[PDB]
Amino acid sequence: MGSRVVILFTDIEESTALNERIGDRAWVKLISSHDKLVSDLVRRQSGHVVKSQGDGFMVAFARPEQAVRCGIELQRALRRNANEIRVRIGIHMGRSVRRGDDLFGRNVAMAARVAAQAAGGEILVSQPVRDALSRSDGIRFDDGREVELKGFSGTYRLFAVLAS
């Protein structure tokens, strides 16, 4: 049930406080610019922005390498811009159900919680994504850390992407 897909979630760290700080006029411009940045970078990695969930986006890729490369590029771009917003990025892969312009299923929820575990400026991936990229000549991960994810039983090991 469901087609295999790689799901990437983004989320701006403390976006409400930011909005309150800079005001709605500045916020609308900021988020408009951010939307364009993400959309552009996703299309460069042949991804698809499924929808804008909260202060971020749900993005679908066919291959985990594309998702990680996208996340790496986004974090680089946001760092360049600051010279400020920090974004969390989470990536998970598995089967999920398509419904119009949306994806449903436990693996969508899992991807969202992986992103929620990430610090601002960090890209976290689930164990299946890390394992799928175990032999990448360019992508590098840390040793991972164990967490429990809301709504799920057991423990999960999440891995941070180490970019050059």
Place this chain on the structure above:
Amino acid sequence: AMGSRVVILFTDIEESTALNERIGDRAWVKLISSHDKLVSDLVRRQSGHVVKSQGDGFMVAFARPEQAVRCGIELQRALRRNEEIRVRIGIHMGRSVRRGDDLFGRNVAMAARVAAQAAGGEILVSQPVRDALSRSDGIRFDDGREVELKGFSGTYRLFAVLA
């Protein structure tokens, strides 16, 4: 805060992930599709407009606060009539920027925080909503509770609808 005055309602299913894990994707997708249909129908009955589906819920715009509250009341009633789904409902009003079929601004964020504060089966409204319904619209509230909302300074008094 900028834009036009709008009443924003958020719905959010309580512990939807645990529910999904319990019944599986096949059953969950069937359940959420049914739920989407239910919410859409009830929103339209009160002249509301579903702006988008935020998480396992919806962001909905209404012109008047009584419309939003009546929608919430009817939704909670319908879910009770009904694999059990409990939903938090939060309602706030204020100026927000409406562009590209979306709503932006601090009052959107505030509405989301109000919904997050609500218990499953509860309809919580901000003080501006409560004050706007002081007239006999056939709606009653509790005495309110004072809480901190993430991202905002100070406290806010939120009122539960007594249906």
